[PDB]
Design a protein around this ligand. Structure first.
Ligand code: HEM
Length: 184
């Protein structure tokens, strides 16, 4: 179940966020903690490709080796709040699972600056969801969360101390695939 109407950042700068570059998940929190593993790797690229607002996703479970990529087309609900479809793809953009009625996520940018962000995601696959999922992002895969984003976590009435870090998982990412997937 998802339970939060996440509030987007006041004055969110869409073009800076959706600039074609990669964001790494450094820390995450699911309000239903059992919905996701205790160790995980995730990243995304976000940009406009031929006029279309896109995200490319990467998930990797460092214990099981489960790996998957997605390409998403985003629709705008309001500034910084989107509804995204998704198709599962290989790293080269070949479709494994097509865009499907009932497979979508909401995506809210609660805070962002040039280097860091806080997002909320509510994933739906049919009648299933993956709970309220918060993630701290950085442009640098190894950056410890700084004061701007940690304060934003507090301003969301959350506690950064309770987020799970991805930093001790030897996460390695294919940035080139994430960038090219934006076009697919
Ligand atoms: C970076 C923002 C993220 C977004 C937008 C996102 C979105 C998604 C989407 C679209 C899927 C379904 C993929 C498919 O079936 O084709 C998925 C699956 C999944 N995600 Fe995320 N995700 C993000 C980060 C994370 C993080 C940080 C975790 C933490 C463990 C996580 C855990 C999972 C798990 C466990 C699944 C598999 C769910 C299932 O089997 O039903 N995700 N995610």
């Amino acid at each position: 179940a998802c339970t939060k109407n996440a509030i987007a950042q006041t004055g969110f700068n869409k073009d800076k966020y959706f600039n074609g570059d990669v964001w790494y998940v450094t820390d995450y929190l699911d309000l239903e903690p059992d919905d996701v593993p205790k160790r995980y790797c995730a990243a995304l690229a976000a940009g406009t490709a031929s006029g279309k607002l896109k995200e490319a996703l990467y998930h990797y479970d460092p214990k099981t080796q489960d790996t998957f990529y997605d390409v998403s087309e985003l629709q705008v609900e309001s500034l910084g709040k989107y509804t995204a479809n998704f198709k599962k793809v290989d790293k080269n953009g070949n479709v494994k699972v097509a865009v499907t009625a009932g497979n979508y996520y909401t995506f809210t940018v609660m805070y962002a600056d040039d280097s860091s962000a806080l997002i909320h995601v509510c994933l739906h696959k049919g009648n299933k969801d993956l709970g309220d999922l918060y993630a701290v992002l950085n442009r640098n895969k190894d950056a410890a969360a700084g004061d701007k984003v940690k304060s934003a976590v507090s301003a969301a009435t959350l506690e950064f101390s309770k987020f799970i870090s991805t930093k001790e998982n030897n996460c390695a990412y294919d940035n080139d695939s994430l960038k090219s997937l934006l076009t697919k």
